[PDB]
Design a binder for this molecule. Structure first.
Ligand SMILES: O=C(Cn1cccn1)Nc1ccc(Cl)c(Cl)c1
Lengths: 300, 237
């Protein structure tokens, strides 16, 4: 079990750690989060009490180094940094754990939610979507746009998700125009899976990371990306059976975890009705259709 | 974007454009089978592609053989249309290719857009106008060449005959759409209006009668009377 210590909490802020969150008051004696499960990526995020504008946060994996948070009063945000002196880190963390100044990552033992939301998400791949190579962690916020969004404006601060466009030369073989637009199997299997992602585990990882950025930061382009990657599978007549079963499980936990009050903005009516009721895979997502109909029947 | 009453004169500027109408591509007769079930029999069709500025009509005839062994023919008809429009543009020299293609039905937008991905600078637009191009098969010489075809075939016409020698393209298009609107609302009356007498003949190289200016005014008035009438007959007013 690992720890993200905090130099201090100088501004009132709601801190999130994965799907958990807690309020910290202005200059409260808060010095970080302990008992973080090793083996998963994590995200630590922030919403200032004063400015609900700009949720932001940091994807990280505690196996890749000792990370702490320090408020920067110039830039005005809580910043993730790496302590490279490992003894200074153990000493500082032990000092605070003894003074009981840390919140414990509150995982219930029965609870596999975070695992199920991040099964295929890997840090190395997150770092390629969020390009900032001097750091082992990755910053994301509400306002960041995607590579595809910048094509339709600062390239350093973008989300480089894989570009998916159903009306593109990449998606449509000359002479198979009708075939490939109504059945996207060519584009999913040859172009994306075989060509770009190499395997379905990388495809799923990008889709899970897209969803998590949409949910935690209200990042619009991430939501677009999530929906697109679902639609591409649902609109392929030919999808490996293991991918369909795995997708059903993925979506199921995403829909389970989504805040009930955010469904109106995070869920695309058209994509979901199409996927569940019209597409080739309308009968292949039993768990996802069942929770969608029982929780968000309004959308359908 | 879409084309409507407000941007109507754009049709007659100097940017090459084509209307495409697919309403006569997939045509059937519905009949009873010996077992008392219903079956369709396809008949020849056509794509109505029209330059509204010059009157050039590229009438791509759709032979029934193209439906043989195919499923979901109404969907396929839309993609066949787009495939034939795309082949048409590629056959034209660059300076003759349209800068816009306007589709008369919105269901053609995706099939055409996908078939024209090679032409990013050709704008595919819908329209809000209720244009009467479906009535093109009420034009005898067009009906005739579609029904007589024994293979796929493209035939080129000028649907304005020689009108542009005397009137503008805006007026020629107004005449054309009044005539077609009439033919669609009451084909028999419309056809009676045009040719019951023979001292105003259709030249061998034309589609419509050789009316004088003064006869076109009378004709045009008779078609409006017809259209307003059928519209009362239809709503009783
Ligand atoms: O890094 C600093 C300040 N600093 C060290 C060297 C130069 N400046 N403080 C610090 C270090 C590590 C951790 Cl884990 C925490 Cl919570 C606080």
């Amino acid at each position: 079990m690992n720890t993200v210590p905090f130099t201090s909490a100088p501004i009132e802020v709601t801190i999130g750690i994965d799907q958990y969150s807690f309020n910290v008051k202005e200059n409260q004696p808060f010095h970080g989060i302990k008992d973080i499960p090793i083996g998963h990526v994590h995200v630590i995020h922030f919403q200032h009490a004063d400015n609900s504008s700009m949720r932001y946060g940091y994807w990280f994996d505690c196996r890749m180094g000792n990370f702490y948070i320090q408020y920067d009063p110039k830039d005005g945000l809580y910043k993730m940094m790496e302590e490279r002196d490992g003894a200074k880190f153990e000493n500082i963390v032990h000092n605070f754990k003894e003074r009981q100044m840390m919140v414990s990552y509150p995982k219930i033992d029965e609870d596999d939610t975070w695992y199920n939301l991040t099964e295929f998400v890997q840090m190395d791949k997150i770092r390629k979507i969020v390009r900032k190579d001097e750091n082992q962690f990755s910053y994301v916020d509400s306002s960041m746009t995607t590579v595809q969004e910048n094509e339709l404006s600062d390239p350093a601060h973008s989300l480089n998700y894989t570009v998916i466009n159903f009306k593109s030369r990449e998606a449509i073989r000359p002479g198979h125009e009708m075939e490939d637009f109504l059945d996207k199997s060519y584009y999913l299997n040859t172009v994306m899976l075989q060509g770009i992602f190499k395997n379905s585990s990388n495809y799923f990882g990008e889709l899970q990371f897209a969803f998590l950025n949409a949910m935690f930061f209200g990042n619009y382009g991430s939501s677009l990306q999530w929906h697109a990657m679902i639609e591409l599978i649902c609109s392929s007549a030919t999808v490996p059976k293991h991918m369909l079963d795995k997708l059903d499980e993925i979506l199921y936990y995403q829909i389970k975890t989504l805040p009930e009050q955010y469904s109106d903005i995070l869920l695309n009516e058209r994509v979901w009705n199409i996927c569940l009721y019209s597409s080739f895979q309308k009968n292949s997502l039993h768990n996802t259709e069942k929770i969608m109909e029982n929780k968000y029947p309004e959308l359908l | 974007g879409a084309m409507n009453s407000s941007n109507y004169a754009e049709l007659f500027n100097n940017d090459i454009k084509l209307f495409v109408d697919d309403t006569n591509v997939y045509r059937v007769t519905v009949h009873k089978t010996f077992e008392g079930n219903v079956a369709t029999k396809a008949i020849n069709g056509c794509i109505f592609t029209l330059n509204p500025k010059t009157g050039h009509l590229f009438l791509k005839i759709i032979h029934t053989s193209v439906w043989a062994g195919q499923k979901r023919l109404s969907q396929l008809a839309k993609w066949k249309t787009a495939e034939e429009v795309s082949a048409l543009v590629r056959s034209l020299p660059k300076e003759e290719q349209p800068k816009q293609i306007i589709v008369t039905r919105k269901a053609m937008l995706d099939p055409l857009e996908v078939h024209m991905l090679d032409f990013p600078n050709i704008a595919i637009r819908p329209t809000e106008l209720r244009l009467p191009f479906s009535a093109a098969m009420s034009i005898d010489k067009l009906s005739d060449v579609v029904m007589k075809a024994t293979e796929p075939q493209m035939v080129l016409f000028n649907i304005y005959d020689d009108w542009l020698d005397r009137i503008s393209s805006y007026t020629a298009f107004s005449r054309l759409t009044l005539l077609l609107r009439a033919l669609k609302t009451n084909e028999e009356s419309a056809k009676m209006i045009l040719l019951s007498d023979p001292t105003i003949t259709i030249k061998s190289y034309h589609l419509w009668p050789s009316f004088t200016d003064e006869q076109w005014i009378t004709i045009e008035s008779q078609m409006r009377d017809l259209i307003l009438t059928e519209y009362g007959r239809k709503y009783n007013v």
